[PDB]
């Protein structure tokens, strides 16, 4: 092939780093460890994929170049460019089945695989929103996603459009997180499940800069444009549970407490909870919360907190890890808990905002 390009080191690094994201150590097919390089007109395109998702970056070529395409080992090529000195000019050209990289008095000869061997869908929904808004939507719910649950449709994040709001939902059957944000566009009602890694990869491409994010949702894929990066992921082919059904219908017991004091109290009590089951107890009474924990060695912790509570006295058990995850995700001053009874879910949210809500199912006392 006639591929030739010379590009300044720092114009390649972030592109190479982003397109390498979908690749993991030791792929199953050799070409999946390579990046696809394409020179056409005045653009160098770089693509990496794991067959489930794909990341594409465009780089403008101001210096002389010749069109062509090939594939090269991702980690080796990135390490070479990043190992070169700041300001280095990186000259690339092909010699048969090898790609050559020259810079200063550094020469590198890499093995290639044909671009023809490197691994089409239509957009149904489109909208734009700030990078910071997508970042918050993901951060607020990511931790509640399932990990390798046999219910594959839970190993991901629901992305839901309704009216003018974009909403994310994540659950593992024991706990749920939902976050809604307005995006100023009239949207059709739609719902898709993004696989875990796609969520993570989409999360990492956001830098909260001034560039907006542009999202395209198809029937089986989702695509995100940010600057000169294009991320595409397949969707999880399944039916997400109806999360509206799990929000406590009529919680008559409301509790409010300082988020940090509540967080540190649960964290200390967790020390003497069962290391496998992590169960703690909440005893709620008039303007008082008592947290207790015990483990098989019969060690015991007790924390007493002043809270605002006027409902009926009750006792309820929780996996303290689930509770701490919520309180850590809430980056606020005060939290509100909404309860029903000892065997029903609890809703937790920032006392000053309903933007995000968290539902945790209790444990057997």
């Amino acid at each position: 092939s006639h591929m030739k390009f010379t590009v300044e080191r720092e114009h390649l690094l972030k592109p190479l780093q982003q397109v390498s994201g979908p690749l993991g150590g030791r792929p199953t097919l050799p070409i999946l460890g390579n990046l696809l390089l394409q020179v056409a007109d005045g653009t160098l395109s770089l693509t990496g994929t794991d067959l489930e998702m794909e990341m594409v970056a465009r780089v403008a070529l101001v210096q002389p170049h010749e069109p062509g395409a090939t594939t090269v080992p991702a980690r080796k090529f990135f390490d070479i460019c990043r190992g070169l000195p700041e300001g280095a000019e990186i000259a690339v050209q092909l010699e048969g089945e090898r790609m050559l990289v020259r810079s200063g008095r550094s020469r590198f000869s890499l093995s290639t695989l044909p671009a023809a061997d490197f691994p089409d869908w239509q957009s149904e929904v489109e909208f734009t929103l700030p990078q910071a808004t997508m970042k918050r939507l993901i951060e607020a719910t990511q931790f509640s996603m399932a990990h390798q649950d046999v219910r594959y449709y839970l190993n991901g994040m629901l992305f839901e459009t309704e009216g003018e709001e974009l909403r994310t939902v994540a659950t593992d059957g024991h706990r749920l997180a939902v976050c809604s944000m307005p995006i100023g566009q009239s949207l059709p009602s739609h719902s898709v499940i993004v696989p875990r890694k796609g969520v993570i990869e989409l999360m990492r491409m956001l830098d909260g800069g001034d560039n907006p994010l542009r999202v395209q949702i198809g029937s089986n894929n989702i695509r995100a444009h940010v600057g000169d990066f294009i991320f595409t992921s397949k969707l999880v082919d399944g039916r997400f549970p109806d999360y509206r059904r799990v929000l406590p219908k009529n919680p008559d017991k409301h509790l409010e407490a300082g988020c940090d004091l509540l967080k540190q109290a649960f964290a200390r009590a967790a020390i003497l909870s069962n290391e496998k089951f992590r169960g703690v107890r909440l005893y709620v009474s008039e303007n008082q919360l008592k947290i207790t924990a015990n483990n098989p060695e019969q060690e015991e912790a007790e924390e007493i907190l002043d809270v605002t509570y006027s409902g009926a006295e009750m006792e309820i058990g929780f996996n303290v890890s689930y509770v701490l995850d919520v309180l850590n995700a809430l980056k606020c001053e005060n939290v509100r808990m909404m309860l029903t009874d000892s065997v029903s879910s609890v809703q937790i949210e920032d006392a000053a905002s309903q933007s995000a809500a968290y539902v945790v199912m209790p444990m057997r006392l």
């Binding site: 059957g173 549970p241 799990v246 089951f277 996996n319 199912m361 209790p362 057997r364």
Partner: peptide
Amino acid sequence: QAXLF
């Protein structure tokens, strides 16, 4: 642990 379903 109880389930949400």
